[PDB]
Design a protein around this ligand. Sequence first.
Ligand SMILES: COc1ccc(CC[C@@H](OC(=O)[C@@H]2CCCCN2C(=O)[C@@H]2CCC(=O)[C@@H]3CCCC[C@H]32)c2cccc(OCCN3CCOCC3)c2)cc1OC
Length: 128
Amino acid sequence: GAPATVTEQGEDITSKKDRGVLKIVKRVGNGEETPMIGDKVYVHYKGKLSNGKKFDSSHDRNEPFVFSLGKGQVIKAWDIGVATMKKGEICHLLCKPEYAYGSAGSLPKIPSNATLFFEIELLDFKGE
Ligand SMILES: COc1ccc(CC[C@@H](OC(=O)[C@@H]2CCCCN2C(=O)[C@@H]2CCC(=O)[C@@H]3CCCC[C@H]32)c2cccc(OCCN3CCOCC3)c2)cc1OC
């Protein structure tokens, strides 16, 4: 399964090197440019609990998910992982609960100590 493949081949992109956020590039994006803190970022994604029956996709709602990079508007794994991406890149991300919703989780939807998996496509980014 895709989560096991990130475990095996995924680069640790954390500062602390605690494997809390693992990344594999599934499709290479354009040029060299990666987004800056405060850039307005547009993505499509697919998210699920790593071993769990909860699945969420922006493709469903026919609208890119938009947020402000590095400002704590998303879980930590995403502030870390999306800052590494190029435009048009698709990556897989495996996120320990430390970089997601933690010991608390976010009930009823997200349980305690949940490891999350994402496929993220970076569509665009532009300066705020
Ligand atoms: C600093 O720490 C946190 C920061 C923010 C949040 C809010 C949750 C935030 O969602 C997320 O961080 C991630 C990454 C972006 C995709 C959504 N996501 C998830 O976990 C999804 C949420 C929906 C869901 O039930 C999914 C189940 C399968 C796992 C992925 C889950 C989310 C959800 C919905 C909308 C969001 O919008 C950003 C809003 N911005 C820009 C527009 O104006 C308001 C600000 C953001 C929690 C945090 O917990 C530690």
